[PDB]
């Protein structure tokens, strides 16, 4: 019953092709969202730095004026 | 030939096992990363709001001090 | 694909740690300074 | 539930005492003109009354109270608070009746644009586009809002958001049979994706869509377009997309429905198709 | 001719096994790590909302006190 | 340990100082005026003490100190600091004795819903639900807490956490509660998922679970349900879950223990079963008659 | 080159101006009582001098300047800036001489724990553990620091960081012929990974390592532990780990050293091992 | 569009008003001596007009107005705000005039790194390198900027970014400059990754590129480095790259172009090229004699 095994192998090959193709399709969009998340992340980082510097200078100036 | 075909059958069953495991693993990949993306988006929005509010806060406080 | 994703995600986390350090320092400094200044400017009268 | 309707009722009573506060503004504030903080706390009680309404599951009342608080709060001071209140009213109105949510979102858009916050303006434009698409049938307004948000994002080097907005607009256009804009957007996005290694693999789909929208309009130019994509991207012919497209366009030379019908059935045998692609194929292959 | 059949078969199984085990081992560590970033960003959210509320209350109290003094 | 011994000694010293400070507070509330600042300093020392207790591994002492600081702070016309201190006390009491942690977390929930911040309220609700489920042997309160969490998340437009919460609550309510609600929520999540590309490939699991629920209730209704699902979800026809269920229902109708047992054994050979699915299969098998 | 030389020259000028500033400022405080602004200015001068020294690629003197600024600032009755200066001094001292970096990081930990914050304390503890591990050989100090950090992480409900620290501690313990602690930690983490929808895939590896380390003691205990683990996790037998363990057990049982070596070689061929696991297997083969 | 034209008109009006405001401010300083509120208000007007103008689809003059406002603000002993405005003006000029953006970015880098922040300086250096290499066809100063960014990143123990920058620099050097620097960098990065938690299986490519550079230098150096890599990295012994390079070397030794051709063609067929290996291979083929 080797011919039956060959037919089963062909069916399994088709199944593997389908599954791998679906995985690749989802991986592409996974790439796209990781790119988007990094894009947003850089902006939030820069905003945090800006607010921190403004806050340090502002509070220090106010404290100096208080004296 | 018998040993080769039996080894190939073992290899194909391992193929299906590994591929299905990786596939479930990948759908988990996607779910988790989408959740993180949403929640970072919310955090970025709140960061921008806080930055603007605290900037206008320092502006008005310094103007009030100048008024004194 | 995954090998490419590895380094990107690792870098994201590595910078996230710096961000959390910075925000922690900022919050601690804000709390201390505001509390001390408020008490000083409210208790002198 | 109804224990939250009771506190909703006393929140209506709080709105009534806010009416008393505006009566104070009418008569007694002549001697209490310095009570600007009184007006501020009147706005605050308005806002938390709207909050109690929202918790009471009265979306219309919650949105109305939010917008009223926003209107009472924009006394030429704390404009950002007024904008936040207006967007909260729009969010409350999103469910139930979203019509006035649209107008209040335009007001927030104007406030932010005057201030200079472009990311928030573009995000709200996308929000109104999606509310139009999901609630109304107009797409042209949604297309315009998406294009405008993409323009904002590209103005500040936010390329990915603009790219996705243009991708959606191009897909709708291809479904809306405006093929020049679709082909231009698809080829531009494909070339942009080819630039970076990260999105290098994705160019195949964009090339395929651009080639399809080419092939619908002018059949002869389909051969030239697929060829051009192939030399521009040497790994496009290898892709199943290019091989399938070549098969379809070569079969169409001879009038034999069996050929391309078998081709499409085989293509669907390996992966299910989408509504856009299936409708496109059924429309185009008819003539 | 079965010799080259066996050669390609052994190459196929060898590359399959190694590469599959590579993917399986690799994904695990990254996704065990992603939760750490998730919880760190949670802490970011908590601290940041507290920070925002703190400045809001501080600024409003300062404005009220300044108005009272004048 | 010398470190812990000295830590405990300094902790007792700070407790004595806090006792002196509360004595000062009660003297300035009845003897003096303007003690609000003095009791604020008392709160500060109490909070320092509580934090260093938590550092000392004395979780009960840390929680008690935090609770005392919080309850004293509630009198200072302030609420956010009270909520934070109550949450800290709940975290300290999470281990060891968590009963009072539930009450303090409920108080924090009250404070938050008074303010207007609801996402934090939903997070605390899920924390209460999970702690109750893991440490208290009772599920109905956990079911209700998850229900309120899902309500808060969905009302705030957070549909994803709400979807997960509904999935969990329905799945567990199936185990001990009538499956009709399991049917409703599973079909609802499947309908929401199929359109969305994210979960469209996994909604077949939800439909299979709901159909199994129907089967454990009755067969004819289970049939009608599975055909309605496949008609609405054509891809489910090719799903191996569909074939497994067709075999199971056919064997059940023909009342053959051997066929059903071998079919479930075949399904077990590949992949793996689960405790809930095995329980459902055993329960339907026991009623084959 | 020229930039570094110019930075160093300007920095030397700034340092000389800084000693002049501190001396004249203390003199003017004594003779005139001008306040504390001059001391703060001197501290800022020290900080800028340290920054420019780091620019000039002189980390020892940069860290010395940072430590001096920290000491001066804490002498001014302020903590956070002093702690930041101390940690910056440690970072500068991280290379070249890290012992004083260790001391200043310990001082930073002391002040941070005095304030009451946990996360930074555990992070500094693990950082000192890493410094000891990479630059020194006293792995016991690294173990102690890892233990403290793990305790803090677990107490603060940060299960992930505590798990990582416990895994490292168990690896180091099993490396130094300690198995009971390693067995306990590995089985604890494996049990913690039972219900995890994600870590369930990794739960098997910890159990495998635990079984190996326990088998370092005797045979019968190893068999009982492995069968108990299989019963606790019914699917553990699916992986090659269980069959490999059983084969090695029987090979050692019947003194089939050559079979053991052949099986280990086959496993290495299919998947290469690491130094630690190879050492464990060779140690097992010794008896 | 009416909105654009109106924006451009009101921006011109605001710029004229700002110029008149600064003139009247310098007049009032002697006239009344009101302090510095006038100058800050003029800077505010300039910034608002510039932001509106860049909203008006026009970029160059918006950046010019931002630069003027930043200069006037820095005249008031304010640096971080002026530096950020300089960075924004440079970003705006990016699409209008590269040189102005480059100069503004240098000024921002200098002021920031004088303050004490190195990460922003390194990011600005990377941006400079990218903007130069993307539109201007030159590398050398781009290489310098990448090296400076890597040095700044390494100064604060940020290893990943510095490693990426060094890898890019080495790749560009190998493409154009001599291979000694490229060989050293590639070997260093490859040898610093045997223990990589997530990069356990790509050092082979780095060492292969180093060996290819060695072969581009000389055959004897090629083979000696090939062994060095073979014994240094046991896993690389079994890599297909090892077999391919050894086959290529033994072919090139015997002076047979056919073997080299077939080997490279088979390697390309099984796996695609990278546009850098192909060029080195062609240069090697040019010296077969």
Residue pair H214/H183 in contact (Cβ under 8 Å)? The answer is yes
Instruction: Round to whole Å and give the CA distance between F180 and F165.
Output: 17
Instruction: Round to whole Å and give the CA distance between G143 and G172.
Output: 8
- Chain F residues in contact with G235 (beta carbon < 8 A): 272
F133 phi, psi to nearest 5 deg:
-65, -40
CA distance G201 to chain B (A): 9
CA distance D95 to chain F (A): 10
How many of the other CB atoms lie within 10 Å of CB of G117? Answer: 14
Cβ pair C29:G80 closer than 8 A: yes
Instruction: Round to whole Å and give the CA distance between H104 and H90.
Output: 5
Q: Which residues contact H6 (CB under 8 A, 6 or more apart)?
A: none
Q: Which residues contact D14 (CB under 8 A, 6 or more apart)?
A: D45, D48, D49, D52
Instruction: Round to whole Å and give the CA distance between G263 and G244.
Output: 8
Query: What single-letter DSSP state applies at residue H13?
Result: H
Task: Take residue B35 and report the two structure tokens written for it.
Answer: 């959740």
Instruction: Round to whole Å and give the CA distance between F45 and F64.
Output: 14
CA distances from G95 to G7, G87, H158 (A): 20, 13, 14
G72 phi, psi to nearest 5 deg:
-65, -40
- The pairs formed by D173-178 with CB atoms below 8 angstroms and a separation of 24 or more are D173/D143, D174/D209, D174/D212, D174/D213, D174/D276, D174/D280, D175/D276, D175/D279, D175/D280, D176/D139
Residue for token pair 């909070």: F47
Give chain E's largest Cα–Cα span. 102
- Residue F161, burial from CB neighbour count under 10 angstroms (0-12, 13-18, 19+): buried
User: Does G touch D (3+ CB pairs < 8 Å)?
Assistant: no
Count residue pairs from C and H with Cβ separation < 8 A.
Answer: 15
Report which secondary-structure segment, H or E, holds F50.
Answer: helix F36-55
Query: In angstroms, what is the resolution?
Result: 4.0
Query: What single-letter DSSP state applies at residue F75?
Result: G
| DSSP secondary structure string for all residues of G111-165 | HHHHHT--HHHHHHHHHHHHHHHHH---HHHHHHHHHHHHHHHHHTT-HHHHHHH
Cβ pair F157:D272 closer than 8 A: no
Instruction: Round to whole Å and give the CA distance between H181 and A61.
Output: 49
CA distance B32 to chain E (A): 8
In chain E, which residue's Cα lies nearest the Cα of C5? E30
Query: What single-letter DSSP state applies at residue H276?
Result: S
Instruction: Round to whole Å and give the CA distance between B57 and B42.
Output: 22
- Residue F135, burial from CB neighbour count under 10 angstroms (0-12, 13-18, 19+): middle
Instruction: Round to whole Å and give the CA distance between D130 and D124.
Output: 10
Beta strand residue intervals within chain H, DSSP E: none
**Angle ∠(G178,G184,G187) on CA atoms, nearest 5:** 125
Task: Take residue H205 and report the two structure tokens written for it.
Answer: 């490519």
User: Does G touch H (3+ CB pairs < 8 Å)?
Assistant: yes
- Nearest partner of H249 among H209, H212, H202, judged by Cα: H212
N-to-C CA span, chain G: 61
- Nearest partner of D192 among D225, D159, D169, D165, judged by Cα: D159
Instruction: Round to whole Å and give the CA distance between G240 and G244.
Output: 6
CA distance A25 to chain D (A): 9
Q: Which chains touch F (3 or more CB pairs under 8 A)?
A: B, D, E, G
Give chain G's largest Cα–Cα span. 92
Nearest by CB to D116, from H51, H91, H272: name it.
Answer: H51
**Angle ∠(H80,H82,H88) on CA atoms, nearest 5:** 105
Instruction: Round to whole Å and give the CA distance between B45 and B40.
Output: 9
Task: Take residue F271 and report the two structure tokens written for it.
Answer: 């992949």
Instruction: Round to whole Å and give the CA distance between G199 and G206.
Output: 11
- The pairs formed by F72-79 with CB atoms below 8 angstroms and a separation of 24 or more are F72/F22, F72/F25, F72/F39, F72/F42, F72/F43, F72/F46, F73/F43, F75/F39, F76/F36, F76/F39, F76/F40, F76/F43, F79/F111, F79/F114, F79/F115
CA distance C6 to chain H (A): 7
Task: Take residue D171 and report the two structure tokens written for it.
Answer: 């897909």
Left, alpha or beta for H157 (phi > 0: left; psi -120 to 50: alpha)? left
Chain C contact for G156 (CB, 8 A cutoff): no
Instruction: Round to whole Å and give the CA distance between C11 and H162.
Output: 11
Q: Within a 13 Å sphere around the CA of H125, how many CA atoms are in the beta-carbon half? A: 24
N-to-C CA span, chain F: 66
Residue pair G130/G123 in contact (Cβ under 8 Å)? The answer is no
Give contacts of H 79-138 with D, CB under 8 A: 91
Count residue pairs from C and G with Cβ separation < 8 A.
Answer: 11
Q: Within a 13 Å sphere around the CA of F23, how many CA atoms are in the beta-carbon half? A: 6
Distance of CA D124 to the CA centre of its chain: 8
Chain D contact for B8 (CB, 8 A cutoff): no
Instruction: Round to whole Å and give the CA distance between H262 and F31.
Output: 101
Q: Which residues contact A24 (CB under 8 A, 6 or more apart)?
A: C1
For residues B10-44, one letter each, b for 16 or more C-beta atoms within 10 angstroms of the residue's C-beta and e for the rest, the string is eebeebeebbebbbebbbebbeebbebeeebeebb
- Chain E residues in contact with B33 (beta carbon < 8 A): 34
- Nearest partner of D142 among D161, D176, D169, judged by Cα: D169
Residue pair D159/D188 in contact (Cβ under 8 Å)? The answer is no
Instruction: Round to whole Å and give the CA distance between E38 and E57.
Output: 29
Instruction: Round to whole Å and give the CA distance between H221 and H207.
Output: 14
Instruction: Round to whole Å and give the CA distance between D204 and D193.
Output: 10
CA distance G197 to chain B (A): 9
Question: What is the sign, positive or negative, of the torsion defined by CA atoms of B51, B53, B55, B58?
Answer: negative
Instruction: Round to whole Å and give the CA distance between H160 and C9.
Output: 12
Instruction: Round to whole Å and give the CA distance between F86 and F82.
Output: 6
- Nearest partner of B67 among H73, E70, E61, E56, judged by Cα: E70
Chain C contact for A47 (CB, 8 A cutoff): no
Chain H contact for G272 (CB, 8 A cutoff): yes
Residue for token pair 């957007």: D185
CA distance B65 to chain E (A): 9
- Nearest partner of F13 among F52, F40, F41, judged by Cα: F52
Task: Take residue F151 and report the two structure tokens written for it.
Answer: 């309500």
Instruction: Round to whole Å and give the CA distance between B54 and A55.
Output: 8
Instruction: Round to whole Å and give the CA distance between H261 and H252.
Output: 11
Count residue pairs from D and E with Cβ separation < 8 A.
Answer: 4
Residue pair H93/H103 in contact (Cβ under 8 Å)? The answer is no
Instruction: Round to whole Å and give the CA distance between G245 and G211.
Output: 8
CA distance C29 to chain G (A): 7
- Chain C residues in contact with G118 (beta carbon < 8 A): none
- Chain D residues in contact with F235 (beta carbon < 8 A): 272
- The pairs formed by F254-257 with CB atoms below 8 angstroms and a separation of 24 or more are F255/F288, F255/F289, F257/F285, F257/F288
Chain D contact for H54 (CB, 8 A cutoff): yes
How many of the other CB atoms lie within 10 Å of CB of G89? Answer: 29
Mutate to test the interface with B, among G160, G196, G200, G201 (most CBs of B within 10 A): G201
Instruction: Round to whole Å and give the CA distance between H150 and H147.
Output: 5
Chain E contact for B61 (CB, 8 A cutoff): yes
Chain D contact for A17 (CB, 8 A cutoff): yes
Cβ pair D116:H272 closer than 8 A: no
Q: Return the HEC string of G96-110.
A: CCCHHHHHHHHHHHH
Query: What single-letter DSSP state applies at residue A21?
Result: H
Instruction: Round to whole Å and give the CA distance between G21 and G14.
Output: 10
Chain G contact for H35 (CB, 8 A cutoff): no
Distance of CA D159 to the CA centre of its chain: 16
Residues of C in CB contact (< 8 Å) with G are: 21, 24-25, 28-29, 32
Q: Which residues contact D240 (CB under 8 A, 6 or more apart)?
A: D267
How large is the angle between the packed helices F203-217 and F275-286, nearest 10 degrees?
Answer: 30
- Chain B residues in contact with D120 (beta carbon < 8 A): 45, 48
Mutate to test the interface with D, among A26, A35, A46 (most CBs of D within 10 A): A35
In chain H, which residue's Cα lies nearest the Cα of C11? H160
Task: Take residue D177 and report the two structure tokens written for it.
Answer: 């049979």
How large is the angle between the packed helices E2-69 and D36-55, nearest 10 degrees?
Answer: 140
**Angle ∠(G176,G179,G185) on CA atoms, nearest 5:** 110
Task: Take residue H8 and report the two structure tokens written for it.
Answer: 């451009």
Task: Take residue F60 and report the two structure tokens written for it.
Answer: 């009960």
Instruction: Round to whole Å and give the CA distance between E32 and H241.
Output: 32
Q: Which chains touch A (3 or more CB pairs under 8 A)?
A: B, C, D, G, H
Instruction: Round to whole Å and give the CA distance between G128 and G134.
Output: 10
Instruction: Round to whole Å and give the CA distance between H280 and H286.
Output: 10
Chain A contact for H221 (CB, 8 A cutoff): no
| DSSP secondary structure string for all residues of chain D | -HHHHHHHHHHHHHHHHHHHHHHHHHHGGGT-TTTHHHHHHHHHHHHHHHHHHHHTT-HHHHHHHHHHHHHHH-SSS-HHHHHHHHHHHHHHHHSS--HHHHHHHHHHHHHHHHHT-HHHHHHHHHHHHHHHHHHSS--HHHHHHHHHHHHHHHHTT-HHHHHHHHHHHHHHHHHTT-HHHHHHHHHHHHHHHHHSSTTGGGHHHHHHHHHHHHHHH-HHHHHHHHHHHHHHSTTSSSSHHHHHHHHHHHHHHS--HHHHHHHHHHHHHHS---HHHHHHHHHHHT-
Residue pair H174/H217 in contact (Cβ under 8 Å)? The answer is no
Nearest by CB to B35, from F160, F201, F202: name it.
Answer: F160
Instruction: Round to whole Å and give the CA distance between D41 and G182.
Output: 62
Residues of D in CB contact (< 8 Å) with B are: 80, 84, 117, 119-120
Residue for token pair 């501020």: D40
| DSSP secondary structure string for all residues of D113-178 | HHHT-HHHHHHHHHHHHHHHHHHSS--HHHHHHHHHHHHHHHHTT-HHHHHHHHHHHHHHHHHTT-
Task: Take residue D73 and report the two structure tokens written for it.
Answer: 């709060």
Task: Take residue F194 and report the two structure tokens written for it.
Answer: 């199929």
Count residue pairs from B and G with Cβ separation < 8 A.
Answer: 5
Task: Take residue D157 and report the two structure tokens written for it.
Answer: 């080097």
- Chain C residues in contact with E55 (beta carbon < 8 A): 30
Count of H-run helices and E-run strands, chain E: 1, 0
- Chain H residues in contact with A49 (beta carbon < 8 A): 117, 120
- Nearest partner of F118 among F162, F86, F152, F166, judged by Cα: F152
Instruction: Round to whole Å and give the CA distance between E9 and B9.
Output: 11
Query: What single-letter DSSP state applies at residue H275?
Result: S
């Amino acid at each position: 019953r080797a011919d039956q095994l060959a037919d089963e192998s062909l069916e399994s090959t088709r199944r593997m092709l389908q599954l791998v193709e679906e995985s690749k399709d989802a991986g592409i969009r996974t790439l796209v969202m990781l790119d988007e998340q990094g894009e947003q992340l850089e902006r939030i980082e820069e905003g945090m730095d800006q607010i921190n510097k403004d806050m340090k200078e502002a509070e220090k100036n106010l404290t100096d004026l208080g004296k | 030939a018998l040993s080769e075909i039996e080894t190939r059958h073992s290899e194909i069953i391992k193929l299906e096992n590994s591929i299905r495991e990786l596939h479930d693993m990948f759908m988990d990949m996607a779910m988790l990363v989408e959740s993180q993306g949403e929640m970072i988006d919310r955090i970025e929005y709140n960061v921008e709001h806080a930055v603007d509010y605290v900037e206008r806060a320092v502006s008005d406080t310094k103007k009030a001090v100048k008024y004194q | 694909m995954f090998m490419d994703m590895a380094m990107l995600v690792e870098s994201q986390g590595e910078m996230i740690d710096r961000i959390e350090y910075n925000v922690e320092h900022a919050v601690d400094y804000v709390e201390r300074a505001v509390s001390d200044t408020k008490k000083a400017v409210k208790y002198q009268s | 539930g109804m224990d939250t309707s009771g506190k909703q009722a006393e929140a209506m009573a709080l709105l009534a005492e806010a009416e008393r506060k505006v009566k104070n503004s009418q008569s007694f504030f002549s001697g209490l003109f310095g009570g600007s903080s009184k007006i501020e706390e009147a706005c605050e009680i308005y806002a938390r009354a709207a909050n109690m309404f929202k918790m009471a599951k009265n979306w219309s009342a919650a949105g109305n109270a939010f917008c009223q608080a926003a209107q009472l709060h924009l006394q030429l001071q704390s404009k950002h608070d007024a904008a936040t209140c207006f967007v909260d009213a729009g969010n409350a109105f999103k469910k139930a009746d979203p019509q006035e949510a649209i107008n209040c979102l335009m007001r927030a858009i104007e406030i932010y644009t005057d201030m200079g916050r472009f990311t928030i303006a573009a995000k709200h434009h996308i929000s109104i586009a999606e509310i139009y698409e999901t609630e109304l049938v107009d797409v042209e307004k949604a297309i315009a809002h998406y294009e405008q948000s993409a323009d904002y994002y590209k103005g500040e080097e936010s390329n990915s958001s603009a790219n996705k907005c243009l991708l959606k607009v191009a897909g709708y256009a291809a479904q809306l049979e405006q093929y020049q804009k679709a082909i231009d957007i698809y080829e531009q996005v494909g070339t942009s994706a080819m630039d970076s290694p990260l999105l290098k693999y994705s160019a195949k789909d964009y090339f395929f869509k651009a080639a399809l929208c080419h092939f619908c309009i002018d059949m002869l130019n389909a051969k030239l377009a697929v060829q051009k994509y192939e030399e521009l991207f040497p790994a496009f012919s290898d892709s199943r997309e290019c091989k399938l497209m070549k098969k379809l366009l070569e079969a169409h030379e001879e009038q034999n429905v069996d050929s391309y019908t078998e081709s499409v059935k085989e293509y669907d045998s390996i992966s299910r198709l989408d509504q856009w692609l299936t409708t496109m194929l059924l429309r185009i292959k008819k003539t």
